[PDB]
Amino acid sequence: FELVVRKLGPVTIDPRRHDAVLFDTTLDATQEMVRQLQEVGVGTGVFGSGLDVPIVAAGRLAVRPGRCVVVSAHSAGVTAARESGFALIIGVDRTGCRDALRRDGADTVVTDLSEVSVRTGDRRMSQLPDALQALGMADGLVARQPAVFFDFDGTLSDIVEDPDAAWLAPGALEALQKLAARCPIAVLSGRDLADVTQRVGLPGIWYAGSHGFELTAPDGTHHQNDAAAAAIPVLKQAAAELRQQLGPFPGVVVEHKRFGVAVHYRNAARDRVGKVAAAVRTAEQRHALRVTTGREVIELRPDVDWDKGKTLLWVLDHLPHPLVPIYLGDDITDEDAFDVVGPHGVPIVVRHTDDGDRATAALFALDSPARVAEFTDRLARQLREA
């Protein structure tokens, strides 16, 4: 395995996203590749020829398929890893079945495992210094003038199982108000632009909704990803389709947002899960959309590359000044933004009790969403200082 240092190669085992790697036994994964994974805290295991099937091998490591990588030189492995929702499936082409393997469900195919990279450099959330404590040291948190970025759910707002029941954590409104008088603020969210705007309820700042595909400036200028916007009518049609197809089956919900269809199947019986999936993959094929899985949801999104780092970099390019970013996030999508804050930027991760001590690119930690309101207040006070 080639080592990539706080970066992302072509094929990358990413500890932040990947808790284990399941190797096909026929592969000869060197002791050097397993040791590489051992230093970054990633478990290994083998499945395959008459041995364990991928999902079983994953169960022995106490790791969900959504957090596991499979590496397989055979078709059965690739396919079984595909129907089991594995996060990353690397096909190893040793018999020139690159096309076959990718038809099976390989996310990507390599000839030799030394083409696979392992991300190094991230620390585990445990290990990180506290943001509040750093903010109050002699030299403060930032040397240069900042622009501050917030994820909404899990960061500014306490996690809730009812999406509609997400509200600003106590004190976070007065805090954002103070800070907003002091520097540019931006809240990021996967919710529609209107929803997050209403829930923060604070004007004269940047709102980025629908996964950064559309934002509002302080002056109220609307901005939208042009290429992504073309898929808006496409998605309304998939939603219309999916509602007729899955309407007969109770416990299955089709939720339509401006840049996505989400199909909730928490209350769906066994064997409509495969049927809920089959319909979304039909919607996929038919409309050239992008499917991604939640825990009990399947989502269709515009087939346009984008992440939270690109939102951040874009918003920054439009800020007046060389403005240094401070970024606060709660989960996995926020790792894209930690990675591009630059040599003076401050990436902060909000810890939860059930988060499991993930590896992260963030430099600091805030203990819960409650401290985020506290951090915001003191930041506004430290900037008023200078």
Indicate the annotated binding residues for substrate. 151-153
Q: Which stretch binds Mg ion (CB under 5 A): 106-114, 153-161, 198-206, 269-277?
A: 153-161
> Smaller CB distance to Mg ion: residue 153 or 241?
153
| Selection from 349, 316, 345 nearest residue 144 by Cα | 345
Residues listed for the chain: 386
> Smaller CB distance to Mg ion: residue 195 or 330?
330
Instruction: Count other Cβ atoms within 10 Å, centred on residue 181.
Output: 12
For tokens 């969403």, the residue is 369
Which amino acid appears at position 59 of this protein?
A: G
Show binding-site residues for Mg(2+): 151, 153, 330
Size of the site for Mg ion (CB under 5 A): 5
The residue number with the shortest CB distance to Mg ion is 154
Contact 314, 294 (CB under 8 A): no
Structure tokens at 147: 């622009």
DSSP state of 50: S
Distance (Å, whole) CA 348 – CA 355: 15
Distance of closest approach, residue 234 Cβ to Mg ion, in angstroms: 26
**Contacting Mg ion within 289-308 (CB under 5 A):** none
User: Binding Mg ion by CB under 5 A: which of 14, 19, 24, 153?
Assistant: 153
Q: Which stretch binds Mg ion (CB under 5 A): 22-30, 67-75, 82-90, 152-160?
A: 152-160
Distance (Å, whole) CA 73 – CA 351: 38
Instruction: Count other Cβ atoms within 10 Å, centred on residue 215.
Output: 23
Annotated catalytic, 307?
Answer: no
Distance of closest approach, residue 333 Cβ to Mg ion, in angstroms: 7
User: Binding Mg ion by CB under 5 A: which of 24, 122, 151, 214?
Assistant: 151
> Smaller CB distance to Mg ion: residue 77 or 154?
154
> Smaller CB distance to Mg ion: residue 234 or 362?
362
Q: Which stretch binds Mg ion (CB under 5 A): 111-119, 194-202, 256-264, 322-330?
A: 322-330
The helix or strand, by DSSP H or E, that contains position 149, with its residue range, turns out to be strand 146-151
Write out the DSSP string of 37-54. Answer: HHHTT-EEEEE-SSS--H
DSSP state of 188: E
Between 326 and 345, how does the x/- string for binding to Mg ion read (CB under 5 A)? Answer: ----xx--------------
Contact 260, 301 (CB under 8 A): yes
Q: Does 154 bind Mg ion (CB under 5 A)?
A: yes
> Smaller CB distance to Mg ion: residue 98 or 352?
352
Is 178 exposed, middle or buried, given 0-12, 13-18 or 19+ CB atoms closer than 10 A? middle
For residue 290, how far is the Cα from the chain centroid? Answer: 15
Distance of closest approach, residue 332 Cβ to Mg ion, in angstroms: 9
Q: Which stretch binds Mg ion (CB under 5 A): 86-94, 131-139, 145-153, 318-326?
A: 145-153
DSSP state of 272: T
Distance of closest approach, residue 72 Cβ to Mg ion, in angstroms: 32
DSSP state of 210: G
Which among 24, 151, 195, 334 is annotated as catalytic? 151
> Smaller CB distance to Mg ion: residue 2 or 331?
331
Q: Does 158 bind Mg ion (CB under 5 A)?
A: no
> Smaller CB distance to Mg ion: residue 18 or 211?
211
Angle at 257 between CA 253 and CA 259, to 5 degrees: 130
Q: Which stretch binds Mg ion (CB under 5 A): 4-12, 69-77, 146-154, 235-243?
A: 146-154
Q: Does 241 bind Mg ion (CB under 5 A)?
A: no
Buried b (16+ CB within 10 A) or exposed e, 303-323: ebebbbbebbeebbeeeeeeb
Between 110 and 139, how does the x/- string for binding to Mg ion read (CB under 5 A)? Answer: ------------------------------
Distance (Å, whole) CA 52 – CA 38: 21
**Contacting Mg ion within 51-90 (CB under 5 A):** none
Interacting residue ranges for Mg ion, rule: CB under 5 A: 151, 153-154, 330-331
Catalytic (active-site) positions: 151
